[PDB]
């Protein structure tokens, strides 16, 4: 067994081993989530096709129950093993308590499994952010996200990755009450938002919708072709 | 100085400098100074505080009906010796039904804090216990230090600014095998006021005083009824 | 040039407790105040962007029904704590049949604070005040990342500790009520946060010998605030 | 205090080179890797007497490339080892730090390893203005396209798009790159307009290696 | 103690981990494979490597390892390393096998595999695997499919990847002629010849030094055929024929 | 102790099963429900003594559900019963061994429908009918006198109907109401609960 | 006590194992010795010089039999070879209480060159300095395989491992063909090994071991003199 104390204090009062870690989250592609009153919108931008590659093997978003959806940044192996973590915790809630999994309650999972890590012997922290998105009982749409260090938060709009600072900067001065008025206006405040970030033409994006009763719906490039139109037709216009 | 690190690595000259640094940490608490009559076994304490209303921190603890002792160090491992200082006193109570012998309790202490000082990361345990008790060969007094070195005495004072009161209790010990509680009381008052500078001295809220006596249960005094045995000094001479 | 994490100082002291005090500073600032009438208990949330949800972080977290806590510097960690607290009050009632003290609350934290190791990772980056109403009235501890408790009539910890602290000690009395106690420690609080004092940036909790632990919420809240 | 850091191939050094295109002021340059000398103690005093020159002249900015070179390699010419490097180092962040007259001079950096070199230099005061060097977009990488490629009579088939997407990390380095190959592979058959399998050779000897 | 510790899990001030992409650098020498698929069947085009006049050539294979009853693998990289995965999914397939009774799909063989490869660079101060591997095979529910591995522990799907030491020089000519679902398995082959024409130094093309293995999906066999040294020179020379031909047509 | 049964057509699985939980002589709740879904073309039929039916059935029933979310895809039928074989099978020799008895009903799109058959020593049996309890020894024979290959699922029911008059005329224990599914291409279906007025 | 749990064996920066490297090179400054498979059997012959003339040459053995059939040479340091010669024995001893038959000679290298990686990626050991030959006839057909301190091994027809063994290869090459008998390839290997030896090639200098379809066994120095005469 492997004993050494990886994460430890600076002389100064930081965790050098954790910081080190938000710079892998710096560099990842860049996920965009905002939560209308009826229907979430989330979507990762930077898909990053080759065209010789199968389109689904690639995916960021996917879900943890029926109405948890989950998309993250960072570097993917540690990704995969987090979900592979949460999707058992969520299911054993069910032999539990009889309802399915809050979307609070999935949260504080990841973040107390993300914290510890940052605690024990022989063990670098985890690289990776996340976004935890659903739409729990009696139907109040929120979203959190998660912080290496393991500070689990909510949002109202938010967004991570390569290039997240001015994408931030962008929805304060863009979110409206009105901008979440209609579920296809929703959608049109997510690709004017990817649309300010690392290019993504339509080519390199791909939301994905939940209307809190489905399950995840991603629309395939033929609305985001259309939608992408109809953005820039009223830009086109307007200025 | 690569020699400066750990536990394990000696000396060229032959001072394993992790146990003298450790010795730093008791002189950093604040002094305390223990005695003995033929009958009895007073040690007294002096409290400090960070501001004037945090309240003070306590040093003398109550181990048994017939052991008492004093802290000076780190609080927490203080504690840490505290909770095994009282298990291996009410089980010995519960298997030979009898009160342990206090000779017989510091040499389970100095088997305790010897093993972290031959290990491999593994600290000393800094700390500054001064214990009193009873055997059936009446008072005793006895220190340790964080060396695993315990010292059998019949007075001693330790903590910051202790070798003022040192010298006091040198040139006092002939009389202190004759006298009742209370003047032994108030000859270790004095040497309190001794190590302290020139303006402030005991008021009332800042010491303690715990009694073992030969008919008497362990007993501490704390802010109120010490104030019986604090009137009946002199005024500091300058 | 790597020293392990159980080591000494020349001066004695040791590296990563002291390394640990520092973090504190670091954190947003809290005020608690013992009063005979009951404990106040009142922080900041330094909030950071417009986006974000003010509610879903907190400071002010409650143990048992008739103690609360506060907490600074770091905050996932400090989670840890708070989940050994709350199993500790429920296994004395267990026991007892009573209720746990607001002293004895404390050192069974303490215990848990240095023990970090080798065998068997590091000290805990957070600091606690535990505000509480046993048998002997209305309580204020505070602890350290080192473990050394002690009981406080009026604490301020977080990054404008010092600060606040030489302001705190010429307004407190030992007869204060709690009505006056609420308002002087908002009057501290609005000294030296960085934005303007309204009813989402800061929250309070009062515990009473009458009723158990309140917290306050913004409907209550802002009339102390209209009336400063 | 001025300095510059990023991959191998950004704008460092050519940046530098526009800034003096459009100075008034006196200007010199050379190289960290130059500061050891086969001999002892050398190095340091060329240092001293140097910044003392620079200082003695006239509005003036002196910038050195690559000290970093000095901080990561070592040549068995050099007498001794690091035992020099320290000391010349040391006098060197001295004497941007002297406690006399620092005189008319300001300073720009340019390292591909900052990271690892001594941060005592990095000391605010010593060093003020402190930027990155990233990797240029590709929608930019469109423009460095232009760039290369307006005075140059290209054939028509010219689909520059196709050809930035090539290394997906490339650099402005390598667009001058592909663009003098292809050039070269006229003049060896004496055409004149630079045609798009040619940019394919291009691409496939300059980068496949 | 703690001054021999070398610390291969921890992270670099700049974000990144040092220690794999240390062992993605020794991955991109000392091997060739690649892979193709666009209809019924999949290959596996590797490159030998010690071609000495003094071997026995036996094994029935060099780089090509049967795993389950109707998939197989190609390795790249440390040899040593190799031979304990190879026999490490070998028995994570048939696990599953004595646990559902029904053949492992593709698929979820790779992600088992792949989580032992991340354990690796994530604790116990342990040196990671220099493997990177390909994985062809057959499933219902998908049907023919094509995984590339990595060292880091982060797969993907794929039709056509190299991972060669001129392996960017393949990719960047695979997707310069390629055809999504028309190549047959002939025009592959064709296509698979042209390939390490280019990325192979040695030049003509010996046939002892490449290796090419065909899964095809006969109706209860998924037949895996390492196919013989009589049948890949008539191959090469077809490739031969056609380029003198539009050579000097052109 | 009770009674299910499994008649199983073409392209159809037709399953019933008793709604009595019992206690020493009183029966505690007259509306109980023996099934378990897994997917939407699976189901689960357990019999036995108090504990086991609930805590081994929904130990199998999060291992299924588990499995979908990890690969995109269900298990087939066949898979889904034989996973449950080996672990009644492995739990066998332990210190604490699981007394459930079972048949398992599930449609895949490939093989069509299908029926299997369990008891607690973990043997299967494809079959094209089954049952369990005490009212399999009346019920068998009405159901092999009366069963062809191809029957459709319109007179599959009136079987059942025949099947369950016999075991109200013949058999001591009291069974008043009965709960039908049928499983086909669009997945579960409830029937009607079919049942005998004791006013 | 316990151990280190920490590899003390890290990739080059240029991606290159170097304490696998560093154990080559011991291997190359060891005892030469060659290896030839000729259609009826293996000849494994070594090169053993004392050093001294106080030295009892029949004491120790450089080849070792494994089981019935499969014998086993080295070119290294002594002390490691030992190690992995007992740890063999075992396991061709396991293979035999389960299946009741003696080892392929291919399965065993399969097993003794998983120990040699498994060694050289643990916590807190340096890796085996020995490389090894081993030999065998298993279902008519002979074999002749190569491991190497990596954990790695080949199927070679004729191979040579130790001082000078890049020479020995090019003579092995003008050489051997593939139609020999047991007895030329004694003659041959002798002819190989007298390359590099000194002057005096006598009974108890080298030491060679055979493999038939009877089985592997053992040279005596008996008619070892009878090779060694009317030899070169
Ligand atoms: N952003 C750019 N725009 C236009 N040309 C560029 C750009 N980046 C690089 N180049 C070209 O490539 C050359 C390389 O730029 P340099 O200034 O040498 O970069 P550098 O990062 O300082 O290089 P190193 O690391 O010292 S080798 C320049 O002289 C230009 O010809
Ligand atoms: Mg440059």
């Given amino acids: ?239 | ?238 | 040039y790597d020293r392990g994490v159980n080591t000494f100082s020349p001066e004695g002291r040791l590296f990563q407790v002291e390394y640990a005090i520092e973090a504190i500073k670091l954190g947003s600032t809290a005020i608690g105040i013992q009063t005979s009438e009951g404990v106040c208990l009142a922080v900041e949330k330094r909030i950071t962007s417009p986006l974000m949800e003010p509610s879903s972080i907190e400071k002010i977290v409650e143990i048992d029904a008739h103690i609360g806590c506060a907490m600074s510097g770091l905050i996932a960690d400090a989670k840890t704590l708070i989940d050994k607290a709350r199993v500790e009050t429920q296994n004395h009632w267990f026991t007892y049949n009573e209720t746990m003290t607001v002293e004895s609350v404390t050192q069974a934290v303490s215990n848990l604070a240095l023990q970090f190791g080798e065998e068997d990772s590091r000290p805990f980056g957070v600091a606690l005040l535990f505000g509480g109403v046993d048998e002997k009235g209305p309580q204020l501890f505070h602890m350290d990342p080192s473990g050394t408790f002690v009981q406080c009539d009026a604490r301020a910890i977080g990054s404008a500790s010092e600060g606040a602290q030489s302001s705190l000690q010429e307004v407190y009395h030992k007869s204060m009520t709690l009505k006056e106690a609420i308002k002087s420690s908002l009057i501290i609080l609005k000294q030296v946060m960085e934005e303007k004092l309204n009813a989402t940036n800061i929250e309070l909790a009062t515990v009473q010998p009458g009723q158990n632990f309140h917290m306050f919420t913004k409907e209550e809240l802002e009339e102390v605030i209209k009336d400063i | ?209 | ?250 | ?199 | ?232």
């Avoid at chain 1, 965009?32 to 989330?42: A, K, M, W």
């Avoid at chain 5, 032992?116 to 529910?141: C, E, M, N």
């Avoid at chain 5, 982060?154 to 000519?173: H, L, Q, R």
């Avoid at chain 7, 010669?85 to 290298?109: N, S």
């Fill in chain 5, 1 to 250: 103690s703690r001054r021999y510790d070398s610390r291969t899990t921890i992270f670099s001030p700049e974000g990144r981990l040092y220690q794999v992409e240390y062992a993605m650098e020794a991955i991109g020498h000392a091997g060739t494979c690649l892979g193709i698929l666009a209809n019924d069947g999949v290959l596996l085009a590797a490159e030998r490597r010690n071609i000495h006049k003094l071997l026995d050539e036996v094994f029935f294979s060099e780089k090509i390892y049967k795993l389950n009853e109707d998939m197989a693998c190609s390795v790249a990289g440390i040899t040593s390393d190799a031979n304990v995965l190879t026999n490490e999914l070998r028995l994570i397939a048939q696990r599953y096998l004595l646990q559902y009774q029904e053949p492992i799909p593709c698929e979820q063989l790779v992600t088992a595999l792949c989580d032992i490869k991340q354990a690796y660079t994530q604790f116990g101060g342990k040196r990671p695997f220099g493997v990177s591997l390909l994985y062809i095979g057959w499933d219902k529910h998908y049907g023919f499919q094509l995984y590339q591995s990595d060292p880091s522990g982060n797969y993907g799907g794929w039709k056509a990847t190299c991972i060669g030491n001129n392996s960017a020089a393949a990719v960047s000519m695979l997707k310069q002629d390629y055809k999504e679902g028309e190549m047959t398995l002939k025009s592959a082959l064709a296509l698979a010849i042209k390939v390490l024409n280019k990325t192979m130094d040695v030049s003509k093309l010996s046939a002892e030094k490449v290796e090419i293995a065909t899964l095809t999906r006969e109706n209860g066999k998924t037949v895996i055929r390492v196919l013989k040294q009589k049948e890949v020179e008539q191959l090469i020379k077809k490739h031969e024929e056609e380029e003198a031909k539009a050579e000097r047509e052109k």
């Fill in chain 1, 1 to 239: 067994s492997y004993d050494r104390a990886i994460t430890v204090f600076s002389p100064d009062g930081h965790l050098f081993q954790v910081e080190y870690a938000q710079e892998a989250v710096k560099k990842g592609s860049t996920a965009v989530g905002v939560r209308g009153r009826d229907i979430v919108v989330l979507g990762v931008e930077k898909k990053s096709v080759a065209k010789l590659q199968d389109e689904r093997t690639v995916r960021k978003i996917c879900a943890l129950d029926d109405n948890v959806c989950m998309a993250f940044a960072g570097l993917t192996a540690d990704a995969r093993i987090v979900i592979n973590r949460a999707r058992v915790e969520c299911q054993s809630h069910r032999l539990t308590v009889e309802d399915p999994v809050t979307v609070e309650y999935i949260t504080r999972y990841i973040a107390s499994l993300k914290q510890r890590y940052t605690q024990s012997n022989g063990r670098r922290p985890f690289g990776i952010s996340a976004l935890i998105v659903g739409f729990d009982f009696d139907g109040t749409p929120r979203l959190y996200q998660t912080d290496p260090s393991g500070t689990y938060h909510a949002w109202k709009a938010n967004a991570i990755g390569r290039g997240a600072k001015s994408v931030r900067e962008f929805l304060e001065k863009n979110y409206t009450d009105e901008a979440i008025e209609t579920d296809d206006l929703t959608i049109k405040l997510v690709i004017k938002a990817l649309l300010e970030v690392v290019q993504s033409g339509g080519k390199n994006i791909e939301l994905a919708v939940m209307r809190r009763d489905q399950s995840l719906k991603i629309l395939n490039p033929e609305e985001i072709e259309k939608y992408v139109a109809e953005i820039e037709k009223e830009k086109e216009e307007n200025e």
């Fill in chain 7, 1 to 232: 006590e316990r151990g280190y749990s920490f590899s003390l064996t890290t990739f080059s920066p240029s991606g290159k194992l170097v304490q696998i490297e560093y154990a080559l090179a011991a291997v190359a400054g060891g005892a030469p010795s060659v290896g030839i498979k000729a259609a009826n059997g293996v000849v494994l012959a070594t090169e053993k010089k004392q050093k001294s003339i106080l030295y009892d040459e029949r004491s120790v053995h450089k080849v070792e039999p494994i089981t019935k059939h499969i014998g086993l040479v080295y070119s290294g340091m002594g002390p490691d070879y030992r190690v992995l010669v007992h740890r063999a024995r075992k396991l061709a001893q396991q293979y035999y209480l389960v299946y009741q038959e003696p080892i392929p000679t291919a399965q065993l290298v399969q097993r003794v060159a998983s120990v040699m990686q498994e060694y050289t990626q643990s916590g807190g050991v340096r890796p085996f300095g020995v490389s090894l030959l081993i030999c065998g006839w298993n279902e008519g057909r002979p074999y002749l395989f190569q491991s190497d301190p990596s954990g790695a091994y080949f199927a070679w027809k004729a191979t040579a491992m130790g001082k000078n063994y890049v020479n020995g290869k090019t003579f092995l090459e003008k050489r051997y063909n593939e139609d020999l008998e047991l007895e030329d390839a004694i003659h041959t290997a002798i002819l190989t090994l007298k390359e590099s030896f000194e002057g005096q090639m006598t009974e108890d200098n080298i030491e060679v071991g055979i493999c038939n379809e009877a089985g592997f066994r053992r040279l005596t120095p008996t008619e070892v003199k009878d090779y060694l005469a009317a030899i070169a």
């Fill in chain 2, 1 to 238: 100085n690569q020699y400066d690190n750990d536990v394990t690595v000696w000396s060229p000259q032959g001072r394993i400098h992790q146990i003298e640094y450790a010795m730093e940490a008791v002189k950093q608490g604040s002094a305390t100074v223990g005695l003995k009559s033929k009958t009895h076994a007073v040690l007294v304490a002096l409290k400090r505080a960070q501001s004037e209303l945090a309240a003070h921190q306590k040093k003398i603890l109550h181990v048994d009906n017939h052991i008492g002792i004093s802290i000076a160090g780190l609080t927490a491992d203080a504690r840490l010796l505290c909770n095994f200082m009282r298990q291996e006193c009410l089980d010995s109570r519960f298997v030979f039904d009898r009160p342990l012998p206090v000779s017989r309790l510091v040499s389970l202490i100095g088997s305790k804090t010897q093993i972290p000082t031959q290990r491999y990361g593994r600290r000393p345990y800094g700390v500054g216990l001064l214990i009193a008790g009873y055997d059936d060969m009446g008072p005793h007094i006895f220190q340790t230090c964080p060396s695993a070195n315990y010292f059998d005495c019949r007075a001693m004072s330790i903590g910051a600014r202790s070798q003022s009161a040192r010298t006091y209790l040198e040139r006092h010990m002939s009389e202190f095998m004759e006298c009742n509680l209370n003047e032994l009381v108030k000859h270790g008052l004095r040497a309190l006021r001794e190590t302290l500078p020139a303006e402030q001295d005991l008021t009332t809220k800042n010491v303690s005083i715990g009694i073992v006596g030969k008919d008497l249960e362990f007993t501490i005094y704390d802010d109120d009824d010490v104030s019986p045995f604090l009137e009946g000094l002199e005024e500091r001479p300058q």
């Fill in chain 4, 1 to 209: 205090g001025v300095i510059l850091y990023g991959p191998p191939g950004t704008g460092k050094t050519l940046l530098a080179k526009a800034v003096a295109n459009q100075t008034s002021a006196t200007f010199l340059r050379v190289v960290g890797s130059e500061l050891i000398q086969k001999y002892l103690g050398d190095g340091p005093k060329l240092v001293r007497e140097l910044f003392r020159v620079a200082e003695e002249h006239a509005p003036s900015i002196v910038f050195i490339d690559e000290i970093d070179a000095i901080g990561t390699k070592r040549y068995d010419s050099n007498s001794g080892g690091e035992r020099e490097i320290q000391r010349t180092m040391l006098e060197l962040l001295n004497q941007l730090d002297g406690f006399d007259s620092r005189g008319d001079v300001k300073v720009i950096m340019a390292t591909n390893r900052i990271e690892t070199l001594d941060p005592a230099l990095i000391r605010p005061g010593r060093i003020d203005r402190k930027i990155e060097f990233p990797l240029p977009d590709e929608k930019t990488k469109k423009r460095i396209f232009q760039i290369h490629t307006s005075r140059m009579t290209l054939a028509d088939d010219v689909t520059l798009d196709d050809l930035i997407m090539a290394k997906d990390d490339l650099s402005g380095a390598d667009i001058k790159a592909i663009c003098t190959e292809a050039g070269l592979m006229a003049l060896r058959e004496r055409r004149m307009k630079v045609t798009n399998e040619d940019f394919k050779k291009s691409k496939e000897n300059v980068l496949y290696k």
């Fill in chain 6, 1 to 199: 102790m009770e009674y299910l049964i499994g008649i199983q057509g073409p392209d159809y699985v037709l399953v019933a099963s008793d709604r009595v939980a019992a206690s020493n002589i009183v029966q505690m709740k007259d509306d109980h429900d023996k099934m378990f879904k897994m997917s939407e073309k699976i189901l689960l039929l357990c019999v036995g003594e108090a504990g086991d039916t609930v805590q081994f059935a929904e130990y199998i029933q999060k291992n299924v559900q588990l499995y979908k979310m990890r690969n995109g895809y269900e298990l087939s039928p066949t898979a889904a019963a034989n996973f449950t074989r080996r672990n009644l099978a492995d739990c066998l020799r332990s210190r604490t061994p699981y007394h459930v008895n079972l048949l398992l009903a599930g449609y895949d799109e490939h093989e069509g429908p299908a029926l299997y058959y369990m008891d607690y020593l973990a043997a299967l049996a494809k079959a094209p009918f089954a049952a369990h309890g005490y009212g399999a020894f009346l019920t068998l024979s009405i159901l092999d006198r009366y069963y062809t290959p191809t029957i459709s699922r319109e007179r599959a029911v009136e079987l059942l109907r025949k099947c369950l008059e016999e075991l109200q005329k013949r058999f001591i224990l009291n069974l008043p109401t009965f709960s039908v599914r049928i499983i086909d291409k669009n997945g579960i279906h409830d029937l009607d609960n079919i049942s005998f007025p004791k006013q």
